[PDB]
Write a protein that binds this ligand. Structure first.
Ligand code: HEM
Ligand code: HEM
Ligand SMILES: [O]
Ligand SMILES: [O]
Lengths: 153, 153
């Protein structure tokens, strides 16, 4: 994973990307298609393009490059936000508090019980299943950080 | 990992939690500590709490309950935001376009090339390493969705 400064570096350079997203998107796809021409075959609209000049002249290529970099930017930003909260929690619970995954299972059990007890009208079988799944995602994401850190959990 | 309706159900019950985060948190920790007393042994600052009534009386147990559920809610919500960004892309790239991970590697390297080419002062060695790592996280996250969707990338 990335450190906090590395995430900020990603954000900073993406701001440059978004300041000229059309130019960046064009250049990315041109680099892809010239370096790896087989990738062109995936694109009905593009697969006839043979030269960088032809690629730069394609309005369809330019708008697709923007679509790609817009989508990737959002994924990167949202990953960064999740990481910024997950990472410190995994770090402290692995290295200072030394909390095994089974104990995260136990608190998940308690959360499910408390929610069912307090809010049965908002916690029927499907909603309880949803929360059970969500808490498992959380535990798994912590466990993956534990493994990176070397903590048995 | 959850459907859209399941995420809605999670966020709906979480809104109920947020109407009294401290009460919910207190109740979760007391459930945990009463059911699994070894978990209370991890909290050196709660060594004075032995009985259920003592737990109920503790200002700091309740405050810690707030800390725990505030953190968990942020992580759950941010996971949901990231999932929702990954979802449309993994759907199409697995099931319609059928883009191998090797082609995602190619476009990742193309992005790094373009950023180096365009911004060498800003996008030096460390920032390039950051972006390289971030794009690997992206590819691995899509690869995990591919396997859930039955697509060998
Ligand atoms: C950073 C990686 C990538 C991102 C963020 C990305 C994003 C997108 C987006 C947002 C769309 C339009 C909506 C959709 O169909 O999902 C799209 C379409 C498509 N992508 Fe990707 N893509 C990536 C990599 C690739 C690669 C490497 C290839 C092929 C070698 C590819 C092939 C396609 C194809 C064929 C379409 C449909 C084009 C059309 O019919 O207009 N994608 N991509
Ligand atoms: C939903 C799961 C959990 C969440 C979101 C959570 C959250 C937190 C947060 C936000 C802190 C303060 C900042 C930090 O040190 O990271 C904390 C501290 C701590 N957590 Fe957790 N925690 C969870 C589960 C557990 C479990 C199950 C245990 C023990 C069995 C545990 C033991 C501790 C301890 C010992 C501290 C330090 C308390 C003190 O300040 O003295 N945590 N936790
Ligand atoms: O794409
Ligand atoms: O905690």
């Amino acid at each position: 994973g990335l450190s906090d400064g590395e995430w900020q570096q990603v954000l900073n350079v993406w701001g440059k990307v978004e300041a000229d997203i059309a130019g960046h998107g064009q250049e990315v796809l041109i680099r892809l298609f010239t370096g790896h021409p087989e990738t062109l075959e995936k694109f009905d609209k593009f697969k006839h393009l043979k030269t960088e000049a032809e690629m730069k002249a394609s309005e369809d290529l330019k708008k697709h490059g923007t679509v790609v970099l817009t989508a990737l930017g959002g994924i990167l930003k949202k990953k960064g936000h999740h990481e910024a909260e997950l990472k410190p929690l995994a770090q402290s619970h692995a290295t200072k508090h030394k909390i095994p995954i089974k104990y995260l299972e136990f608190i998940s059990d308690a959360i499910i019980h408390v929610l069912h007890s307090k809010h049965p009208g908002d916690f029927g079988a499907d909603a309880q299943g949803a929360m059970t799944k969500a808490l498992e995602l959380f535990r798994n994401d912590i466990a993956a950080k534990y493994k990176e850190l070397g903590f048995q959990g």
